[PDB]
Enzyme design. Structure first.
Site, PDB file in Angstrom:
ATOM      1  CG  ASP A  35      -1.835   1.179   1.306  1.00 41.65           C
ATOM      2  OD1 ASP A  35      -1.955   1.902   0.291  1.00 41.65           O
ATOM      3  OD2 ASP A  35      -2.439   1.380   2.398  1.00 41.65           O
ATOM      4  CB  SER A 199      -2.259  14.388 -13.393  1.00 41.11           C
ATOM      5  OG  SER A 199      -2.660  14.145 -14.723  1.00 41.11           O
TER       6      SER A 199
END
EC number: 3.4.23.22
Length: 330
Positions: A35, A199
């Site tokens: 994770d 992004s």
């Protein structure tokens, strides 16, 4: 040194991925959920409340000659989906894909919430976010990656998650045969303890690319792609019959639909998520309403590039002094 381990979807929907991990001496092999959105290595154990164990493999520290109780240390964690676990702490030898760390904090669960009990395939979590998020008290502990770092050939790990197929976590090297074209690297902020990056925008299907900054985290422990409501609305508007359902808890769409791809920007590069990756199947057994793999992050408080996005790429988690993230197509 390096390590290389295969990671395998737990079910037919790629809801999560498990990777075998050797703990203790002699080795006890547990299948852990790696994770990159948390920083605790915790396991089902001989200390876990019996009624909360349902098929998991447990770590038994009393059977490990190298286990030592970390005196006074406790841990307690809550995850973004509302699940939780807590317990006490041992140090022991931990190996992943041939890479061994001695003195790793292994957090032994005394209690786990129902979602963990109900998932018989996940024996615990191995956190790969920054050690500043580790929950051990009163002395915070380091992640497996942080402990391994100085010994690694290069201070990196890579995630290569499969779509309905096994994939790979590598530590200490970049497998140049595992991706196509070039890796595009982008800046990381560790301010919140996550692999947080921005992004450069998105496209829906064959549509034009929208240049826009989307701050989010690369999180292998989250199944879906959670993005701003504007972006998610633009995506689902291209699917006939799609709608946001408060009763179901997100966007649903007719199972008969063909889903468009979703592209996200990494610098000047583009990663394309095929439409099939976005179909998470019937909302309930036998239903013709299907659950979407792109959902709004509104009210999560953060955008999350979960498995839906990451499995479309070869992803480099660069833990150099100035951390960065790299993405390549594959």
């Amino acid at each position: 040194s390096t390590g290389s381990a295969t990671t395998t979807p737990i079910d037919s929907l790629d809801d999560a991925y498990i990777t075998p991990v050797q703990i203790g001496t002699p080795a006890q092999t547990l299948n852990l959920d790696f994770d990159t959105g948390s920083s605790d290595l915790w396991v089902f154990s001989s200390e876990t409340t019996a009624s909360e164990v349902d098929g998991q493999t447990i770590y038994t520290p009393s059977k490990s000659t190298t286990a030592k109780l970390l005196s006074g240390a406790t841990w307690s964690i809550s995850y973004g989906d509302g699940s939780s676990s807590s317990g006490d702490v041992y140090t022991d030898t931990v190996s992943v894909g041939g890479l061994t760390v001695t003195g790793q904090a292994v957090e032994s669960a005394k209690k786990v919430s129902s979602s963990f009990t109900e998932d018989s395939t996940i024996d615990g979590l191995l956190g790969l976010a920054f050690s500043t998020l580790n929950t051990v008290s009163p002395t915070q502990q380091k992640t497996f990656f942080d402990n391994a770092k100085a010994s690694l050939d290069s201070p990196v790990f890579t995630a290569d998650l499969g779509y309905h197929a096994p994939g790979t976590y590598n530590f200490g090297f970049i497998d140049t045969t595992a991706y196509t074209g070039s890796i595009t690297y982008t800046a990381v902020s560790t301010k919140q303890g996550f692999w947080e990056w921005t992004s450069t925008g998105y496209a829906v299907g064959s549509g034009t690319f929208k240049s826009t900054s989307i701050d989010g985290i690369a999180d292998t422990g989250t199944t879906l792609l959670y993005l701003p409501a504007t972006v998610v609305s633009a995506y689902w508007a291209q699917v006939s019959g799609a709608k946001s359902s408060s009763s179901v808890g997100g966007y649903v769409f007719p199972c008969s639909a063909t889903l468009p791809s979703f592209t996200f920007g990494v610098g000047s590069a583009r990663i394309v998520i095929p439409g099939d990756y976005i179909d998470f199947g019937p909302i309930s057994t036998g239903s013709s309403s299907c659950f979407g793999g792109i959902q709004s992050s509104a009210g999560i408080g953060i955008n999350i590039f979960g498995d839906v996005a990451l499995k479309a790429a070869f992803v480099v988690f660069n833990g150099a002094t100035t951390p960065t993230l790299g993405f390549a197509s594959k």
